[PDB]
Amino acid sequence: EVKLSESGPGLVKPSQSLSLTCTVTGYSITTNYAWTWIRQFPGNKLEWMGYIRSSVITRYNPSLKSRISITQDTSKNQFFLQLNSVTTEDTATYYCARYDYYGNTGDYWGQGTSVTVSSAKTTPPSVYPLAPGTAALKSSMVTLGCLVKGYFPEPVTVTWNSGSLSSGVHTFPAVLQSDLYTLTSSVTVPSSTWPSQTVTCNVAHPASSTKVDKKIVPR
């Protein structure tokens, strides 16, 4: 199974270098392909950044001028992106991919890693429970939620009951204000299951190494 996976910092300061790693599994980066970096900007435009092939031969998008280097470490089955002198325009989701001569990638794109370029400080979220005001039409369904307020940078991950509750969940895109993001997540469950059985949202913010659980208790 050929898989690729990106890793690296989710936040970089302007003027410094962005570095990302692509770890290739199920395939040798010595098999003959264009090991490629692509990025997708906010608003979703895609840009080809460059490739490495045959361990040492690269080509880059001229848009990146002299700021990009792609290298590899055959011993670790990894290739690397270095983008120097970054600015806020380099904020994007970064993907690695394996292209062949004919443009076939197979299913071999990474899941993508967000990198934000900003001078703003890493900040963990406050997580607040959203419990219904009073009571309403039971023997049907109830909607609960959590408000994830004041974090930086993106992303957070939200689960309910440690991922056991996956149906009936809506996690909304974050909104940015004053260098902080806020998002909310709703979950809808049968009214026979809450408050009888507990409902907890789990909120991870990898950039700050924080994970919070918030049990939703009746008001």
Binding site: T105, D107, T184
Partner: protein, 216 residues
Amino acid sequence: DIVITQDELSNPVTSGESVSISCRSSRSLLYKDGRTYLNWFLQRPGQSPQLLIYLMSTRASGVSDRFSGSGSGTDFTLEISRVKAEDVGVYYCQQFVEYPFTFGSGTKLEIKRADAAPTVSIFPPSSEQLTSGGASVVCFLNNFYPKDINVKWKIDGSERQNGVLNSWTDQDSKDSTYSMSSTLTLTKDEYERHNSYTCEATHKTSTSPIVKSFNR
């Protein structure tokens, strides 16, 4: 470098219908080996792009035979046969004939389904947030179709616009609906100056707004 253009889809497609999506290159993508170097990708909501077609008409392994590519050296068509809810997302073309392997800006497929009214819920600030001096009131407007919707906040019966932030999901890959969250944020002191908090959703499914409120 090569300019790639895609047409927008002006109308949503009902499950079971077929739809063509088109892209255009300023330069021919036909190469000297007789192959035309054009790829199609689908990016489903929240996912990485997935290759559907390469070399203009060759299906990637594992891809449904409902996806087929055709065209000339400069005009290309992806045909999606018997569209399913799970096909929703953005379809991109990419030229692969010369660097910098440019992508088109995408074509969003929307699925047409039966109108559905939003399920509206409102939530007061938590005790925890109030202790820190803040007060956010949250309203969810869930699982509606079509996507066009208006949310209005009222405090003690007066329309309130300042301090409101909204967010919308992409179309759901399973039920083809949309959802939206609206959050009104005030200081604790401002929150405690009023009693009634209301969020009103206006959607084509009704003449009258769906109104949800609480009293502090």
